[PDB]
Ligand binder design. Sequence first.
Ligand SMILES: CC[C@H](NC)C(=O)N[C@H](C(=O)N1C[C@@H]2Cc3ccccc3N2C[C@H]1C(=O)N[C@@H]1CCOc2ccccc21)C1CCCCC1
Ligand SMILES: [Zn+2]
Length: 90
Amino acid sequence: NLSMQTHAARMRTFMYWPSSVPVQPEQLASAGFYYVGRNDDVKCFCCDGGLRCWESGDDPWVEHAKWFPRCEFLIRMKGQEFVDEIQGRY
Ligand SMILES: CC[C@H](NC)C(=O)N[C@H](C(=O)N1C[C@@H]2Cc3ccccc3N2C[C@H]1C(=O)N[C@@H]1CCOc2ccccc21)C1CCCCC1
Ligand SMILES: [Zn+2]
């Protein structure tokens, strides 16, 4: 995942992303995720968190904060406040 530290490199992994998945590469790459080349499995370049089974309306940033709240990339991009709220702390 060192190769995956840039937005451009992440975007390139979605070459063979299945077109039927209802979440788009741009939103995934922007939230830190790259395609691992099987089904709809993606991983974060920073925290190595894996996500799959994307559904219509899923928001990669929200899912990042839901499952991997301590990710430093996530915190730097969205802030600890956003992460806390996703985690149900106000
Ligand atoms: C990504 C949005 C999606 N919306 C439905 C979603 O919530 N996906 C979950 C998801 O992607 N998860 C959830 C699991 C549960 C969990 C508990 C504690 C810490 C992390 C956790 N999750 C991570 C993630 C997941 O299953 N990742 C898998 C397992 C680890 O290995 C890989 C590697 C690549 C891609 C995915 C995963 C999903 C997994 C299977 C179907 C049910 C929910
Ligand atoms: Zn992460």
